[PDB]
Amino acid sequence: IXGPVLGLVGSALGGLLKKI
């Protein structure tokens, strides 16, 4: 229900995701 958290989450989520 947030909005600006979803970006930090998707930022950290995709972070380790695309990380080598």
Side-chain angles (χ1 to χ4, degrees):
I1 186 160
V5 183
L6 152 72
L8 335 181
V9 106
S11 254
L13 275 180
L16 218 305
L17 241 50
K18 96 106 247 233
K19 251 310 83 129
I20 314 119

